């Protein structure tokens, strides 16, 4: 979501929405708006190392960087690895990738798992919301597999509700019968139903067949359950 | 002929549910209602 950060005298005062018709267009979620104060607490402000007693103590940039450089020169290949978090940026990601490629390391991994079999990240359309958030307003039937868009993507669910209100959109969900603020069709929570819809037994197979602009959205949280490839 | 007696005396024997009882009685004479196609606008 596009936002406006209001700051005064070097301190972040508040967060406001910013009109972007394709993404959020006037709104932000409550976590976006009201979690900026967490930037003023538990902040890491100095480099730290471990002393002789095993506790974390402050140090200069030179000392910590020298320790890390020595340890990085000691090992190479598979012994060097990296894990990236949820709020990392592309510049830091590419820098870390290059740094571990210098020591001949490819163990560069995230925390959110995606099925690497098949195309597996080779084709960019294999892990994207190809229809886009705006395109939701053009669909007529939507299926949601193993996701709760209300909390995982509040503005995406707001777009879904907007289309459901103005375009008479039909919504179905495979998973837990959560509250989505709009009425939908619950097809169950067993993943087996998916194969049935692929087989053609389930009537929603016919509904998707008759759909002019069908949409099938799989939640990336549903891929974490060790069978996400299936 | 008479033009001097008040003959709207039945309104002295109307109970709490008289209107609703008459509605229940009339329910059988009504024609079937149309349908918008939904259970409610929230559907």
The string of DSSP codes covering B4-24 is S-----GGGS--TTHHHHHHH
Phi, psi dihedrals of residue A108, rounded to the nearest 5°: -105, 105
Phi, psi dihedrals of residue A151, rounded to the nearest 5°: -100, -35
Bridge-based pairing of strands A214-218 and A141-145 is parallel
Nearest to B42 by CA among A180, A148, A143: A180
Alpha carbon distance A101, B43 (integer Å): 55
Bridge-based pairing of strands A185-186 and A170-174 is parallel
Which residue in the block uniquely carries the two structure tokens 């349908």?
Answer: B35
CA separation (Å) from A93 to A75, A88, A110, A201? 21, 7, 10, 45
């Amino acid at each position: 979501s596009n936002i406006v950060v209001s700051t005064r005298t070097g301190e972040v005062m508040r967060i406001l929405p910013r009109m972007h018709e394709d993404i959020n267009e006037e709104w932000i979620s409550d976590k976006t708006r009201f979690a900026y104060d967490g930037l003023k607490r538990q902040r890491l402000t100095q480099p730290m190392i471990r002393n002789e007693k095993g506790l974390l103590t402050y140090t200069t940039w030179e000392d910590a960087l020298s320790r890390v450089a020595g340890m990085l020169q000691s090992f190479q290949g598979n012994d060097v690895a990296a894990i990236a978090g949820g709020l990392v940026d592309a510049e830091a990601l590419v820098a870390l990738k290059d740094l571990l490629n210098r020591v001949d390391s490819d163990s560069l991994c995230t925390e959110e798992v995606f099925p690497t079999a098949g195309a597996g990240t080779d084709l960019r359309s294999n892990y994207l919301l190809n229809t886009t958030i705006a395109g939701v307003e053009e669909a007529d039937v939507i299926l949601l597999v193993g996701t709760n868009p209300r909390f995982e993507a509040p503005l995406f669910n707001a777009r879904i509700r907007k289309s459901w209100l103005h375009n008479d959109l039909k919504v179905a969900l495979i998973g837990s019968p959560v509250d989505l603020t709009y009425r939908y069709d619950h097809l169950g929570d067993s993943p087996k139903i998916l194969q049935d819809i692929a087989s053609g037994n389930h009537p929603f197979s016919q509904i998707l067949k008759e759909a002019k602009k069908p949409m099938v959205v799989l939640g990336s949280s549903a891929l974490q359950r060790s069978d996400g490839t299936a | 002929f008479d033009n001097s007696t008040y003959r709207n005396l039945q309104h002295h024997e109307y109970s709490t549910y008289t209107f609703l009882d008459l509605n229940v009685e009339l329910s059988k004479f009504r024609m079937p209602q149309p349908s918008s196609g939904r259970q409610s606008p929230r559907h």
